[PDB]
Design brief:
This is part of a larger assembly, with ten protein chains of nine kinds. By secondary structure, chain A is an alpha/beta fold. Chain A has helices spanning 27-39, 99-113, 131-134, 151-158, 187-197, 214-228; strands spanning 2-4, 16-20, 42-47, 56-57, 72-73, 75-80, 85-90, 117-125, 139-143, 166-167, 177-178, 200-208. Chain A has six helices and twelve strands. In chain A, strands 1-3-6-7-2-8-12-9 form an eight-stranded mixed beta sheet, sandwiched between helices. In chain A, a hairpin with a 4-residue loop joins strand 6 and strand 7 (85-90). In chain A, helix 1 crosses helix 6 (214-228) and helix 2 (99-113) packs across helix 5 (187-197). Chain A is globular, with a radius of gyration of 19 Å. With 96 residues, chain C is α+β, with helices and mostly antiparallel strands. Chain C is 29% helix and 25% strand. Chain C has helices at 2-6, 12-23, 77-87; strands at residues 44-50, 53-60, 64-68, 70-73. The relative contact order of chain C is 0.16. Chain D has six helices and eleven strands. The N and C termini of chain D lie far apart (57 Å). Chain D has a single domain (2-245), classed as Aminohydrolase, N-terminal nucleophile (Ntn) domain (Glutamine Phosphoribosylpyrophosphate, subunit 1, domain 1, 4-Layer Sandwich), CATH 3.60.20.10. Chain D is α+β, with helices and mostly antiparallel strands. With 241 residues, chain F is α+β, with helices and mostly antiparallel strands. Chain F has one domain (1-239): Aminohydrolase, N-terminal nucleophile (Ntn) domain (Glutamine Phosphoribosylpyrophosphate, subunit 1, domain 1, 4-Layer Sandwich). Helix content of chain F is 35%, strand content 24%. In chain F, the strands form two sheets. Chain F has a five-stranded antiparallel beta sheet. Chain F is globular and about 50 Å long. The chains are: A alpha/beta (264), B alpha+beta (246), C alpha+beta (96), D alpha+beta (245), E mainly alpha (127), F alpha+beta (241), H alpha+beta (232), I alpha/beta (277), J alpha+beta (239). At the A-I interface, strand 4 of A face helix 4 and helix 5 of I. Chain G: Belongs to the peptidase T1A family. Chain G: The modification Phosphoserine is found at residue 16. Chain G: It is found in: Cytoplasm; Nucleus. Chain G: This is Proteasome subunit alpha type-5.
Chain lengths: 264, 246, 96, 245, 127, 241, 49, 232, 277, 239
């Protein structure tokens, strides 16, 4: 459930909820770090549930010594009421048999709190890309049937590629078609439950592998910024790119620790 | 716990890759074997029935292994070619060492040991072939065996493999009379069953090949029925079904 | 083998060392086929009498042995070892 | 790295994709462009010429060690395009296989038979899960006995074919179009005309006026069947003779 | 007189029914001058080629040839069934020569073959 | 190149074997070695880092003697560098045994570089994470300097630098007119360049490791004698300030 | 940042980032499924129960 | 398209019994250059489309229609290197048969031995199937033979067939125009027409290859002979 | 998984846990054979507070039946040893329940003590290793759903120095060292440097700190990053700075005898196995 | 975090150019117990701390005998130490057989380096998880060598390896200027004081937990254990 930081709900009246999925490469989570850092969003609550492995650490978006000591837990909610944007950041992994319960709790919060849209930043396995998908763009999208508030036309004008519908159960020549995001984690569960509950959800994803997945995170936030304009539009600057998403200070030592001596 | 290798048991003791290998035959053409008092037969559905396919070797499915045995495969065709070659080799090796023709169950057992070896060592796909053996030997007389990709054989008095094997087996079990079968009644039952289980098309003596094994004057006679006899059997069945209707 | 070659009884520690040479040869499967490919899941307790009097050895799933004076192995080795901790004194009779 | 096959339709050499394509072989073909050098081989009436770029991007590097033209046998020379170490290793293999042929058959290997042997080995690499293709292309030249000049091109897939002119590298398509246009008009280029054709193809598709130190030229001739690599003075003579015209 | 009785330790065990008729008395002097020359001919040819590659080109050359030979010989057929050695012949250079091993006493029709599991687990070094 | 970079037998969608590229970065992990070829020899010099004051001086050497006439200066993993030193020694000895004379340096470089390449080919072994330079001198061949890197590419150089600060050292070598200098002035300049590119704060307390092969040693690889090394270090220090 | 799954115990020959081989300690846990055996070494002999 | 890894392993059946890596090798054949085989009353025709279609190819160098013996000949559609490695093997097998039995190998025997090699490659793991399906034409016992061996190692005896790109339309074309009493000349005309069905533009004698097999034996038609056949 | 045979197709590890498919293709036709197994496994791995001489069914959360004003949790061998040696050496501590739980890595479970002199003070003593799907159950069985904000929780635990993320080598750091992580309502500053920004803590200590953060309870987590994670004397002594802090202010009476208790408890020394030295 | 794909095998280079299983093997060395090696002008001594679960077990055998002139002290996995000790003993036997003379310590250590380098490149292997302190004596004097899981070896004036060995190395760095002219007694005392520096302030060296091995100009390699160490420990001033 949602627990505020100040004994008062923040009134997310018509906000857009940006959330990750714990997916392959942690691309959704890294993109959420990029968004929360660049927009300079302020924590407004927690999403306390039984569903994610508990973890804790100081402020991952430290900029000054004053706020570098702010404790953070595995699921925290950030907001930017100027732009009517609210963001969830899941910083852990799901406990066995607990992904679906999290999805219904979260979507119940979305319906109760009054959020208009939901946008899930996710990823999928790129070793499962078939013949065509190898020669297409890495980025795919999904829109639930409700998500039509003039954004179907916007996405169409953006020349994006929808996620390809595989057949529900193979080996049948009839091949009833339903979505399958392999390696998206809760992405498919969130999509199916949003379609059931009539929530305007969008899913943006990239076909990624694992390793240094920071380029993939930057690509995914640029995809989202093609849609939403949460930032000044891309190649319009004197190439001041690379200086337009603020890398959080916690993005340090991403390959571990330092090199031992007496090797090399 | 899962089904990626032949060398992995699921946590209820199932070898899923072998079960999938055995699932490939249910696509293949219906091979039927019936044991009689004076002979054995193999009735096989000609799956390859295209217009431009050539008139081929004396039988598409029926293979001779000895002077005394024949087989009839269903499943992956290339694996079947390998396996029938090795069957013939095994039989000639027994004849070379003992100077006597191989008994039928010893040949079946040897091939099924080969198939089991492929279901046991990792990094080797099992044989997607279920065979059907008919023969004669001085020990047990006319014999009919069956074999499946797991190297698991058994002797029958009437069995079917391939497409619609379950309906065929139900029909045989209902109509096969143990002890009172002769080769003509076995041929009638073979046509009847192989008709009711080939209901994708009307039965004609171009989609079935029948081979009978008998003993005539101290020699075994493996004979593949000519196309003009299978038509006579089909007519006998159609007239019988007309009479039994009205 | 030791008796055949040297005409004498192998000492307790030497037997334990030979068994350890066998037991520590896991992993490294594609080097001497017929090797084991995983640790042995058994702990042994060699107790014998040799030139150096009574001796007790312990080997665990490592192919490694240490001489001991009171060992418990098995499912209740912690409690039994804590009990052997006080009930044992270095000069006690075999009946005790 | 240890062992296994990577799962994916473009991630192991022994995996087909739904369209029956071996993508790791095509990625090897892209590895040929790793280096940024183009090679041109042109067959004439009585000679064969291989011409390649010679980029040395280092004042400190001894430029006489940078070379892509190799001598396989005394009468076969090749220009290697692609990854440098892979090129040198495939040259070593071609040298060994040619020596074996002379040992077994008593006469020196032809060009077509050498590219066939190298392409057989390359096919074996594409079919097995332990090895990988080499990211290189071999263009062989020689004078046979009774056919004439020969230019042959092995490639990472195990495919080989004889040509009248061929290219490898970054500008392979542009050079192939250039040489097609040249060969449609006339083909019995004497010896000078083949060298001018190869140099002009390279200097047109790259739009670069060459210096004798930015280009390598190896030739065979019917009268001098031995593979020869021209000195800088000879290449400069050809370039000045091309410029004056 | 061969010496070598490991007899220090002649503790080895054999399967009596599977050893057949072995006569170490005469297994020290081949039956013909050509017996071993023909038994180990591909072995000796590989050793000669690796030696010339080593001496002319370096360690890498025999190592790569042996590594290719090891790789292709490993995606094969289980030992109780005959293989074609298609890739191994392409590597060794026997794809276009026919020797007497190819036409005499054909391996594809052996006249004698053992049990599947016994032959597989002998190749695995398990005996 | 994630997804295509766990094996040395996988090509990236743009024809790049990435395990080999990561092995070359592994070479960039270590301190710098430079080698300068002059008018009458070759001089090696290694910014050897003092791991502890407890190590006997001369331990962890990075300047091997591969043959009577060849010297080897390494960077990268030191275990890999020692294994490749063993291989190069084997190659030189085998050549001498077969053919009865000292192996040419170009041929030695080819043999060892082709070994390194052979490791860049299989899933069963990983590429060498070590780069090295060979340097010889013969009266009938002149000075010769070769560098092999983890991909198996060996070229001939007039001045080379391998290691962490190869780029700065390469900038500093280019100022030398080494084609017209003797081994003595090159030793002083090698010490100077080693002192310039040393990072005194990140890394700490290095010791010079100078070596030559030339006509001043009669085509024999040697350690620079203690007094000449002292003079070179004093020149290098006084030039730094 | 993030909590992620790291597994160093599903194969022998793999050290954890701690210098520790887990498939051998899982074999010691395999011992702890056996029955209890007590061995006492005295100067009068050794007993095994 | 990764069915739970049933798609990427050659030695894993799918739950329905399919081996969907040998049918991906059949998609390499169906993406190769078109081939045609027509067994006339007195001979067989093997016509294919050349990939070496530009002016810069030496055409005395590499061929897609190959002889195995005097009386057997191949064409393929699929992956060319696999074809070459199988062709040298087929030639070796034919010469071993001659050396043992002192008689030319029959077409069916050769097809069987080649198919056994292909089958071997579809069963191990760590290896890859062959990306070629062959057409074997032969003449034995005064009787033409046309066979087809696919990557799985399962061979078929045909009266007429088509491989490579656009082969379903090719087979439909062949059904409407093949009759048993066809003579070898009308067979060559029909094979060239079936190639002309699925062909990328103007068809020259220099971008198709034809090889016939009659009593006199297998022979590859010269570009002049193909030019003459195309002119009619 | 890691290539049981030559050329076996292997899938890479996924650090996001999405190789489990999150139990995808859920199979709404789960056989009762499957459901019995799943429920039996869920029952085997349950947490259960039980009272002494009651032995079962505590039925309510442990901090909501007794009032609390101070709660010290020690997790692991070294934290438990330190807390016992330096705190229970004083006046009588009364046990008010254990938390029985089964696990693959579980090992004395938390026994909970509350001081007789001051009943409001509590201690959890886990050598108990609580698995991921047991930590929230542990939290509800101990704290419950009525988080009174008068408590001062103090968690103590040990971590291996190789878990420290630092730009230097994790062999050059002066282990063992203490790092803190406090919640927002913890007004006092720590006695140790706060843990860095790329470093996180993920277990039962993280569960308790997260609970206290969400429900606005003061809490401090003390992390010993040690190079020896077995029962070690230096590691236990690394926690001593904590004794001069208001939570552990009145509980530490005799330090000199605590060193003797500690030396004894080291001589007990659960037997090491022979993998090493 | 971005490290998980590249640290499970010793055949995978991380995109930072690091093999991580090598570093984890080095940690395996740190998981032993401290052992010290130091040398004078005439002797090379090896001092080791033994653990025995603190009661009811004969302690680990931490100093092993390789030849009459070579002895090793181990820290790390015991199986690896035994494999390497068997290798060292066989190589010393081979030298005595073929050449009749004691194998030089440096040559032995080079052979160990190659032997232990092979597992760090090959598939289906793991590095050796044992680090050694080899004490030798040959024609060139006393020797102290340190071998690592990474297959590196170092020529030491003195060295400590094992758990909490940094304190011993700090002591040895502080006092190494006087090791060379020390006689055997005070050299072993120096090693003993360093090994004591690897201990808590309360614990002290006893005969039950100290093993010593001396090689030298006159001595063959001898190991002193459990009661033979008393002459060396009696004279050791308190901490």
């Amino acid at each position: 459930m949602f627990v505020p930081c100040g004994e008062s709900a923040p009134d997310l009246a018509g906000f857009t909820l940006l959330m990750p999925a714990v997916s392959v490469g942690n691309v959704g989570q890294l993109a959420m770090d990029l968004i929360i850092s660049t927009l300079n969003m302020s924590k407004i609550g927690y999403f306390y549930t039984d569903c994610l492995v508990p973890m804790v650490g100081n402020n991952p978006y430290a900029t000054t010594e004053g706020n570098s000591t702010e404790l953070s837990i595995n699921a925290e909610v950030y907001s930017l009421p100027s732009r009517k944007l609210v963001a969830l950041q899941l910083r852990s992994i799901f406990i066995k048999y607990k992904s679906k319960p999290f999805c219904e709790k979260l979507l119940s919060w979305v319906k109760s709190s009054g959020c208009a849209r939901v946008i899930v930043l996710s990823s999928s396995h790129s070793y499962q890309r078939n013949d065509l998908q190898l020669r297409s763009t890495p980025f795919r999208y999904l829109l639930t049937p409700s998500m039509q508030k003039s954004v179907q036309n916007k996405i169409k004008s953006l020349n994006w590629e929808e996620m390809e519908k595989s057949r529900c159960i193979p080996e049948i020549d009839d091949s009833e078609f339903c979505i399958r995001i392999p390696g998206g984690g809760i992405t498919k569960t969130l999509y199916d439950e949003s379609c059931s509950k009539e929530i305007q959800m969008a899913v943006l994803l990239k076909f990624v592998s694992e390793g240094d997945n920071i380029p993939d995170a930057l690509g995914l936030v640029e995809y989202l910024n093609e849609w939403l304009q949460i930032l000044k539009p891309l190649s319009d600057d004197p190439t001041v790119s690379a200086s337009r998403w603020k890398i959080p200070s916690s993005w340090r030592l991403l390959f571990g620790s330092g090199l031992p001596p007496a090797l090399f | 716990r899962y089904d990626s290798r032949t060398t992995i048991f699921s946590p209820e003791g199932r070898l899923y890759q072998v079960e999938y290998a055995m699932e490939a035959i249910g696509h293949a053409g219906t091979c039927l074997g019936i044991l009689a008092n004076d002979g054995v037969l193999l009735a096989a559905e000609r799956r390859n029935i295209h217009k431009l396919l050539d008139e081929v070797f004396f039988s598409e499915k029926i293979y001779k292994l000895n002077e005394d045995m024949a087989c009839s495969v269903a499943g992956i065709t290339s694996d079947a070619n390998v396996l029938t070659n090795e069957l013939r080799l095994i039989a000639q090796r027994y004849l070379l060492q003992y100077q006597e023709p191989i008994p039928c169950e010893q040949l079946v057992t040897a091939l099924c040991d080969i198939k089991q070896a492929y279901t046991q060592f990792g990094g080797k796909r099992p044989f997607g072939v279920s065979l059907l053996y008919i023969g004669w030997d001085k020990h047990y007389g006319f014999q009919l065996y069956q074999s499946d990709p797991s190297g698991n054989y058994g002797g029958w008095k009437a069995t079917c493999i391939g497409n619609n094997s379950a309906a065929a087996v139900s029909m045989l079990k209902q109509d096969y009379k143990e002890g009172e079968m002769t080769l003509k009644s076995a041929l009638a039952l073979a046509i009847k069953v192989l008709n009711k289980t080939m209901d994708v098309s009307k039965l004609s003596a171009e989609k079935v090949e029948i081979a009978t094994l008998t003993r005539e004057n101290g020699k075994t006679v493996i004979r593949v029925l000519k196309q003009k006899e299978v038509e006579q059997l089909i007519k006998k069945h159609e007239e019988e079904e007309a009479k039994a209707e009205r | 083998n030791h008796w055949f070659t040297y005409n004498e009884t192998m000492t307790v520690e030497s037997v334990t060392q030979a068994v350890s040479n066998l037991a520590l040869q896991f992993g490294e499967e594609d080097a001497d086929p017929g090797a084991m490919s995983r640790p042995f899941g058994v702990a042994l307790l060699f107790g014998g009498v040799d030139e150096k009097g009574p001796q007790l050895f312990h080997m665990d799933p490592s192919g490694t042995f240490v001489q001991c004076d009171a060992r418990a192995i098995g499912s209740a080795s912690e409690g039994a070892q804590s009990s052997l901790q006080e009930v044992y004194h270095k000069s006690m009779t075999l009946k005790e | 790295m240890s062992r296994g096959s990577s799962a994916g339709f473009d991630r192991h050499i022994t995996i087909f994709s739904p369209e029956g394509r071996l993508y790791q072989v095509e990625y090897a073909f892209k590895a040929i462009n790793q280096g940024g050098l183009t090679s041109v081989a042109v067959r004439g009436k009585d000679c064969a010429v291989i011409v390649t770029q010679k980029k040395v991007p280092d004042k400190l590097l001894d430029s006489s060690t940078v070379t892509h033209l190799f001598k396989i046998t005394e009468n076969i020379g090749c220009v290697m395009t692609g990854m440098t170490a892979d090129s040198r290793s495939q040259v070593q293999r071609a040298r060994y296989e040619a020596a074996n042929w002379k040992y077994k058959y008593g006469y020196e290997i032809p060009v077509d038979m050498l590219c066939k042997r190298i392409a057989d080995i390359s096919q074996v690499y594409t079919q097995n899960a332990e090895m990988r293709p080499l990211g290189c292309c071999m263009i062989l030249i020689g004078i046979d006995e009774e056919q004439g000049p020969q230019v042959y091109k092995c490639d990472p897939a195990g495919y080989y074919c004889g040509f009248k002119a061929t290219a490898a590298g970054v500008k392979q398509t542009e050079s192939t179009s250039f040489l097609e246009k040249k060969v449609k008009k006339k083909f019995d280029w004497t010896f000078e005309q083949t060298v001018e054709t190869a140099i002009t193809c390279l200097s047109t598709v790259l739009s670069i006026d060459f210096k004798p130190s930015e280009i390598e030229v190896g030739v065979v001739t019917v009268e001098n069947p031995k593979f020869r690599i021209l000195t800088e003075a000879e290449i400069d003579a050809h370039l000045v003779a091309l410029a004056e015209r | 007189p061969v010496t070598e009785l490991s007899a220090s330790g002649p503790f080895e065990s054999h399967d009596l029914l599977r050893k057949g008729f072995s006569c170490v008395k005469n297994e020290l002097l081949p039956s013909h001058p050509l017996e071993l020359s023909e038994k180990n001919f591909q072995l000796n040819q590989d050793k000669m080629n690796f030696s010339t590659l080593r001496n002319i080109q370096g360690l890498f050359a025999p190592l790569k040839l042996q590594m290719e030979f090891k790789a292709v010989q490993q995606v094969q057929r289980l030992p109780f069934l005959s293989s074609s050695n298609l890739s191994l012949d392409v590597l060794r250079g026997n794809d276009e020569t026919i020797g007497f091993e190819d036409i005499l006493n054909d391996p594809s029709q052996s006249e004698v073959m053992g049990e599947p599991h016994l032959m597989v687990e002998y190749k695995l070094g398990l005996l | 190149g994630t997804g295509y970079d766990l094996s040395a037998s996988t090509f990236s969608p743009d024809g790049r074997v990435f395990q080999v590229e990561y092995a070359m970065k592994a070479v960039e992990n270590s301190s710098t070695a430079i080698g300068i070829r002059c008018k009458d020899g070759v001089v090696f010099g290694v910014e050897k880092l003092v791991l502890s004051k407890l190590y006997e001086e001369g331990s962890n050497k990075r300047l091997f003697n591969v043959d009577r006439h060849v010297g080897m200066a390494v960077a990268g993993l030191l275990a890999d560098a020692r294994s490749l030193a063993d291989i190069a020694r084997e190659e030189a000895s085998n050549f001498r045994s077969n053919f009865g004379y000292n192996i040419p340096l170009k041929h030695l470089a080819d043999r060892v570089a082709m070994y390194v390449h052979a490791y860049t080919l299989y899933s069963a072994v990983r590429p060498f994470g070590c780069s090295f330079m060979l340097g010889s001198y013969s009266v009938n061949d002149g000075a010769q300097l070769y560098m092999i890197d983890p991909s198996g590419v060996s070229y001939g150089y007039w001045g080379c630098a391998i290691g962490k600060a190869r780029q700065a050292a390469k900038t500093e070598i280019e100022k030398l007119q080494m084609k017209e200098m003797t081994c003595r002035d090159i030793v002083k300049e090698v010490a100077k360049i080693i002192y310039i590119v040393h990072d005194e704060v990140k890394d700490k307390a290095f010791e010079l490791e100078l070596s030559w092969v030339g006509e001043l040693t009669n085509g024999r690889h040697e350690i620079v004698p203690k007094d000449i090394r002292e003079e070179a270090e004093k020149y290098a220090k006084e030039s730094l300030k | 940042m993030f909590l992620t799954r790291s597994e160093y115990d599903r194969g022998v020959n793999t050290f954890s980032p701690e210098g520790r081989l887990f498939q051998v300690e899982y074999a010691i846990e395999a011992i702890k499924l056996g029955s209890t055996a007590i061995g006492i070494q005295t100067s009068e002999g050794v007993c095994l129960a | 398209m990764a069915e739970r890894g049933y798609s990427f392993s050659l030695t894993t059946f799918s739950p329905s019994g399919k081996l969907v890596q040998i049918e991906y090798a059949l998609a390499a054949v169906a993406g190769g250059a078109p081939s045609v085989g027509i067994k006339a009353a007195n001979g067989v025709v093997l016509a294919t489309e050349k990939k070496q279609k530009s002016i810069l190819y030496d055409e005395r160098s590499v061929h897609k229609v190959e002889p195995i013996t005097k009386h057997i000949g191949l064409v393929y559609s699929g992956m060319g290197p696999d074809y070459r490695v199988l062709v040298h093997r087929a030639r070796k097998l034919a010469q071993q048969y001659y050396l043992v039995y002192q008689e030319p190998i029959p077409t069916a025997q050769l097809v069987q031995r080649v198919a056994s090699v292909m089958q071997e490659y579809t069963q191990s793991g760590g290896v890859r199937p062959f990306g070629v399906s062959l057409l074997i034409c032969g003449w034995n016992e005064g009787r033409p033979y046309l066979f087809q061996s696919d990557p799985s190692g399962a061979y078929f005896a045909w009266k007429a067939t088509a491989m490579g790109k656009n082969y379903v339309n090719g087979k439909t074309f062949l059904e409407k125009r093949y009759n048993e009493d066809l003579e070898l000349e009308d067979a060559i005309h029909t094979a060239i027409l079936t190639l002309k069905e699925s062909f990328e533009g103007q068809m020259t004698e220099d971008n198709i290859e034809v090889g016939i097999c009659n009593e006199a034996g297998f022979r590859r038609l010269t570009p002049t002979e193909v030019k003459d056949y195309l002119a009619a | 998984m890691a290539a049981t045979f030559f050329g076996e197709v292997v899938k890479a590890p996924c650090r996001a846990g999405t190789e489990d498919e999150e139990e995808e293709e859920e199979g709404r036709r789960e056989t009762p054979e499957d459901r019995e197994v799943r429920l039996q496994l869920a029952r085997k791995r349950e947490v259960r507070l039980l009272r002494r001489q009651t032995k079962t069914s505590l039925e309510v959360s442990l901090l909501e039946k007794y009032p609390c004003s101070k709660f010290i949790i020690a997790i692991g061998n070294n934290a438990v040893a330190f807390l016992s040696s330096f705190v229970m050496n004083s006046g009588v501590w009364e046990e008010v329940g254990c938390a029985k739980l089964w696990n693959e890595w579980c090992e004395a479970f938390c026994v909970f003590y509350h001081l007789k002199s001051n009943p409001s003070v509590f201690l959890c003593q886990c050598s108990c290793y609580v698995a991921e799907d047991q930590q929230y159950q542990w939290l509800e069985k101990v704290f419950g759903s009525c988080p009174r904000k008068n408590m001062q929780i103090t968690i103590l635990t040990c971590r291996h120095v190789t878990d420290y993320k630092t730009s230097e080598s994790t062999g050059s750091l002066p282990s063992p060292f203490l790092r803190a992580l406090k919640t927002q309502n913890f007004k006092d500053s720590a006695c140790c440097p706060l843990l860095e920004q790329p470093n996180i803590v993920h277990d039962l200590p993280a569960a308790v700190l997260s609970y206290c953060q969400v429900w606005k309870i003061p809490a401090i987590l003390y992390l010993c990053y040690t190079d020896v994670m077995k029962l070690d004397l230096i590691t236990v002594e690394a926690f001593k700075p904590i004794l001069s802090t208001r939570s552990l202010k009145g509980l530490v009476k005799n330090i000199p005898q605590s060193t003797e208790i500690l030396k004894k408890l080291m001589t007990t020394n659960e037997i090491q196995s022979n993998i090493y030295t | 975090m971005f490290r998980n794909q590249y640290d499970n095998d010793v055949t995978v280079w991380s995109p930072q150019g690091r093999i991580h299983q090598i570093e984890y093997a080095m940690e395996a060395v740190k998981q032993g117990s401290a052992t010290v090696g130091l040398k004078s002008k005439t002797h090379a001594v090896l001092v080791a701390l033994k653990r025995a679960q603190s009661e009811l077990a004969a302690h680990q055998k931490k100093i092993l005998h390789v030849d009459n002139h070579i002895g090793i002290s181990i820290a790390g996995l015991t199986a690896d130490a035994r494999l390497l000790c068997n290798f060292m003993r066989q190589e010393c036997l081979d030298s005595r057989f073929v050449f009749d003379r004691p194998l030089p310590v440096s040559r032995l250590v080079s052979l160990i380096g190659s032997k232990t380098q092979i597992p760090t490149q090959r598939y289906g292997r793991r590095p050796y998880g044992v680090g050694l302190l080899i004490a030798g004596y040959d024609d060139m004097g006393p020797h102290i060598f340190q071998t690592c899981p990474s297959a590196n070896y170092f020529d030491c004036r003195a060295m400590s390896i094992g758990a909490r060995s940094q304190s011993a190395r700090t002591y040895l760095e502080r006092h190494m200027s006087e090791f060379m002219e020390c006689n055997l007694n005070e050299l072993v005392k120096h090693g003993l004081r360093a090994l004591r520096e690897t201990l808590p302030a309360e614990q002290d060296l006893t005969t039950k937990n100290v093993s010593i091995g001396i090689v030298g100009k006159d001595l063959e390699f001898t190991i002193y254990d459990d009661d033979d160490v008393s002459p060396f420990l009696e004279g050791l001033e308190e901490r």
